[PDB]
Structures are given as C-alpha cells and as structure tokens.
Amino acid sequence: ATYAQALQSVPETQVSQLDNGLRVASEQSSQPTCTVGVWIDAGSRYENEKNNGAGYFVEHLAFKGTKNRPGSALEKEVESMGAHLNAYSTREHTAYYIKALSKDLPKAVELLADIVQNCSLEDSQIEKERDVILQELQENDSSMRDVVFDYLHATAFQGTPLAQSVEGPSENVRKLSRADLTEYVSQHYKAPRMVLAAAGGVEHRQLLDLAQKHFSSLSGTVPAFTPCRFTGSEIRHRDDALPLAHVAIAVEGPGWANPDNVPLQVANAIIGHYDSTYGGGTHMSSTLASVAATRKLCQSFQTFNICYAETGLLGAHFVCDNMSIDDMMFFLQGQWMRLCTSATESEVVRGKNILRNALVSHLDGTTPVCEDIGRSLLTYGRRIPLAEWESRIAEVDASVVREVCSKYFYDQCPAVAGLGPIEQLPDYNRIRSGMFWLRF
Amino acid sequence: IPFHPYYTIKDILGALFMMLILLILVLFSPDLLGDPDNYTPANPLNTPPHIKPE
C-alpha cells in the first residue's frame, strides 16, 4: 500500500437521481454507524432584503416539531435510538444530518422526510423562537471572529445578496411572519435543489428505496441567484475597549469551479496558520508564522478560502494587539508577494503535502464524508474522488503557483474588515500600495 | 491619516503650482518685481532719484 494504492482502495460514492430530481448519493463502508442528511441549496445568498434571515428561522423551526410528529415527539425519537440530529445553514447551503446506527437508517430517513417536507411552522413556536434568535444574535455580536467575517462579506459584496448575513438583521427577525417562512420553504426546499447524502454503513440500494418511499411526494420535476460583484472596500469598527483587534483582508478568489482553486489552496498552505499556543513556534516553515512567533506580533492568524458558486474570498485573518497591526499587514503582504513573484519549488512541495494531508485527514469519520458528499454534489456537481484531488495537486508546480497568485493577488484591490483597537491599521491606500511591488 | 499616501502627493501638487508661478515670473517678466535702477554700476557719487528696498 504505497499511498496511491490506498487512494484507489477508497470506496466510491454511488450517485442516483429520483424522478423528483432528488440526487440520492451514498458511500458504502463497513462501520456500524452512519450519517444521513439532506443538503438543500437554500441560504442567505438566495434571500432578498425583506426575506433576509428566513432561512435561519426555518432551520431553527425545523427540529421543533413537525406535522406528523408533534413537537418534542420528533426529538423523542432522535434521542430514543441514540441518533444525533444536527443542522447548519451557510450563506449558500443548508443541511440537516442525523447521526445514527446502521440499523436505524430506515427510521432516520423517515425523520428527515418529516423535517424538510411536513414542517410545522407553529405560530406560538415562532413567537418563542423569535426572542431566542434575538438572544443568539446578541451572543454572536460578542463573537469577534464571526462579526469580522460578516463585516468582510458586507464590505466586499456590498449591494449584492452575498453581503447579507446568515441570521439577517434584527429588524427582519422581528418582522418575519409565518407566511414568509412557509413561502420560503415552499420556494427554496425544492426537490431538484436537494441532495440526500448518506455516509457510513448504508447500502446505496437501501438508501434509494428509502428515498423513493419517503421523499417521493416532493416538488415536481425560481431563485437562481445573480452574479455578485466584488467591491474592494474597507470597514473600520474602531472600538478601543476591545482587548484585541481582529483584521480580515481578502481578494476576489475563484469559485467552486475554476480549478485554479487547487493551486491557490497550495499557496494558502504555504502561508499556513499560527496562534500563541502552538508547537515549534519560531521554527515552522511559514515565514509569516516564524516571524510572528519570533516577535510575538499576534495571538492568531489564518488563511481562508471562502469560495462561492461564481466568486469567492481569498485572504487572511489575524488577531493581534493594537500595537502590531501595521507590522503584520507588512509581513502578510510581503509573504503574498514573495509567493507571487518567486515561489520556489521546495515551498510548493511543502504546500502540496500540507494540502494532501488536509484533504485526506478532513475526510475521516462519517460526518465529514457525508458533508463532503452533500456539498460536492451541490457545488461541483460530482463527488470528486480523492485520486482526482491527488492528480490535481500533483500537477501544481512553482510556475503554476506563481501564475495563479499573480492572477489573483498582484495589483488587486482588497477588501478589509477591522474590528477593535484598529487605529494602527494602515489606511486603504497603504494597503493597496502593499498590493504591488516596485522592485518587480 | 498617514502622511505618505496623501500629503506627499498634495505637497507635490502644491510644489508644481508654485513652480508654475515662479517659472512664469522667470521666463516672461523676469524683472517684474525688480527695480530697473539695479542694472547700473554702483556709483557712490550719484544717488538714485528714488531709493527703495525690494
């Protein structure tokens, strides 16, 4: 088993398609557990200004009682057989997955059929949930990471649905009524926009039979989004009482398509990640992280690759004190243009290995495998096998990384979002000047 | 605001405008702000009819 043989030995993801348009897919294994869930193409990207937050609201209400299962009775099932019911709604995806035993798949799918089709939307339950969402919004206000990322989205995609947050404004939260929720679920939770993923010890034919027996009476056989526009801007929520200063700087990246994602991830793998409670410290190959550990510039930093259907954000997010924002902006831009102008071969090899490890280790356990299945059948349109990922990483070299970074980084207007004691944060002109090198 | 990205170019524009005015003076009316009597050898035996500074 020389790695490549191990990659070939990974079982494939069989994909089917119901008459209603449900893309039933499954990956068979030998584990005695399973994770089955539907991924829907709803989210804030498909939400208008007045509807903003309806997806989060309906996701909240989904588990709190159905039509056939009144209230906690549904929950009474999930705990009775040891299942873990969970959900998450991204800006472009929504999902409700139920961890269960391999022998509980016939029931679990049934529960899923109840959650997405025969929902309740009880008015009194809506009233109880409204204040809960308000308090959750207040809790997220203290989340200086999520707040900064929402600031980045708003200041990068201003004037487009992508700028909208997942939870939506509090005004919409209090305004939203049952009619809007049922209209939203009837318009977005359509069969062609749903994929019933199931990883673990589930046989694909059994999954197909269950889906045909439960998800049959869905929609027959329309929000298709609008191409959003990137607008290099900046938001400075100067608040000196905050202890640290979260900064996020991004550029218009690629989408789920546009294979340039694979080299680009490698570049991010070169920059890497670091925080105070790390290991080697002033020895890690990342020059950014090594310098940060040497001079203690920050408490954290990361490189994200948020990519949507047609566009996406590529950049970094660092958490540091008030007296070191300028230095880390300098070093981060220096690393970006070092990769842009002369990426070398050894760093590219290290990035390839890091990306290989990320993809391989991320896809362990039934939950990440099922999530990958559901997300890939929506974004890529196909569950990309790990062998294809290996080949695509292998094709990446120094010249490819330099070219792709030049395409996406060099002389590009970034979007900046700072929160906290960000007085040191250089003005947007200085950042944009850092986005190009005079020597080169 | 940082001095560099804004006030360097602002002072560059100001310097260009001052250069424009100074060059107008030098190239078109060099002796506009100058007494013609200065173009005469300094004779200590004869005062100018009018004596004034610059």
JSON list of N, CA and C in Angstrom, two decimals, chain A residues 426-430 433, chain B residues 1-6:
[
{"chain": "A", "resi": 426, "resn": "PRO", "atom": "N", "xyz": [-3.15, 50.31, 8.70]},
{"chain": "A", "resi": 426, "resn": "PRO", "atom": "CA", "xyz": [-2.80, 51.30, 7.69]},
{"chain": "A", "resi": 426, "resn": "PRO", "atom": "C", "xyz": [-4.00, 51.68, 6.83]},
{"chain": "A", "resi": 427, "resn": "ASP", "atom": "N", "xyz": [-3.99, 52.92, 6.36]},
{"chain": "A", "resi": 427, "resn": "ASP", "atom": "CA", "xyz": [-5.07, 53.39, 5.51]},
{"chain": "A", "resi": 427, "resn": "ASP", "atom": "C", "xyz": [-5.13, 52.56, 4.24]},
{"chain": "A", "resi": 428, "resn": "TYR", "atom": "N", "xyz": [-6.31, 52.57, 3.61]},
{"chain": "A", "resi": 428, "resn": "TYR", "atom": "CA", "xyz": [-6.54, 51.68, 2.48]},
{"chain": "A", "resi": 428, "resn": "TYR", "atom": "C", "xyz": [-5.55, 51.94, 1.35]},
{"chain": "A", "resi": 429, "resn": "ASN", "atom": "N", "xyz": [-5.09, 53.19, 1.21]},
{"chain": "A", "resi": 429, "resn": "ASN", "atom": "CA", "xyz": [-4.10, 53.47, 0.18]},
{"chain": "A", "resi": 429, "resn": "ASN", "atom": "C", "xyz": [-2.79, 52.75, 0.46]},
{"chain": "A", "resi": 430, "resn": "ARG", "atom": "N", "xyz": [-2.37, 52.71, 1.72]},
{"chain": "A", "resi": 430, "resn": "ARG", "atom": "CA", "xyz": [-1.14, 52.00, 2.05]},
{"chain": "A", "resi": 430, "resn": "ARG", "atom": "C", "xyz": [-1.29, 50.50, 1.81]},
{"chain": "A", "resi": 433, "resn": "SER", "atom": "N", "xyz": [-1.17, 49.95, -1.91]},
{"chain": "A", "resi": 433, "resn": "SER", "atom": "CA", "xyz": [0.22, 50.05, -2.33]},
{"chain": "A", "resi": 433, "resn": "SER", "atom": "C", "xyz": [0.98, 48.78, -1.97]},
{"chain": "B", "resi": 1, "resn": "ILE", "atom": "N", "xyz": [-4.47, 60.64, 9.44]},
{"chain": "B", "resi": 1, "resn": "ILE", "atom": "CA", "xyz": [-4.13, 59.85, 8.26]},
{"chain": "B", "resi": 1, "resn": "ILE", "atom": "C", "xyz": [-2.62, 59.80, 8.12]},
{"chain": "B", "resi": 2, "resn": "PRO", "atom": "N", "xyz": [-2.06, 58.75, 7.52]},
{"chain": "B", "resi": 2, "resn": "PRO", "atom": "CA", "xyz": [-0.62, 58.73, 7.27]},
{"chain": "B", "resi": 2, "resn": "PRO", "atom": "C", "xyz": [-0.22, 59.83, 6.30]},
{"chain": "B", "resi": 3, "resn": "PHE", "atom": "N", "xyz": [0.96, 60.39, 6.53]},
{"chain": "B", "resi": 3, "resn": "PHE", "atom": "CA", "xyz": [1.42, 61.49, 5.70]},
{"chain": "B", "resi": 3, "resn": "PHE", "atom": "C", "xyz": [1.70, 61.04, 4.28]},
{"chain": "B", "resi": 4, "resn": "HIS", "atom": "N", "xyz": [2.23, 59.83, 4.10]},
{"chain": "B", "resi": 4, "resn": "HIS", "atom": "CA", "xyz": [2.77, 59.43, 2.81]},
{"chain": "B", "resi": 4, "resn": "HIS", "atom": "C", "xyz": [1.72, 59.40, 1.70]},
{"chain": "B", "resi": 5, "resn": "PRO", "atom": "N", "xyz": [0.71, 58.54, 1.74]},
{"chain": "B", "resi": 5, "resn": "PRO", "atom": "CA", "xyz": [-0.12, 58.35, 0.54]},
{"chain": "B", "resi": 5, "resn": "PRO", "atom": "C", "xyz": [-0.92, 59.58, 0.14]},
{"chain": "B", "resi": 6, "resn": "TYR", "atom": "N", "xyz": [-1.11, 60.55, 1.03]},
{"chain": "B", "resi": 6, "resn": "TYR", "atom": "CA", "xyz": [-1.96, 61.70, 0.75]},
{"chain": "B", "resi": 6, "resn": "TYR", "atom": "C", "xyz": [-1.17, 63.00, 0.66]}
]
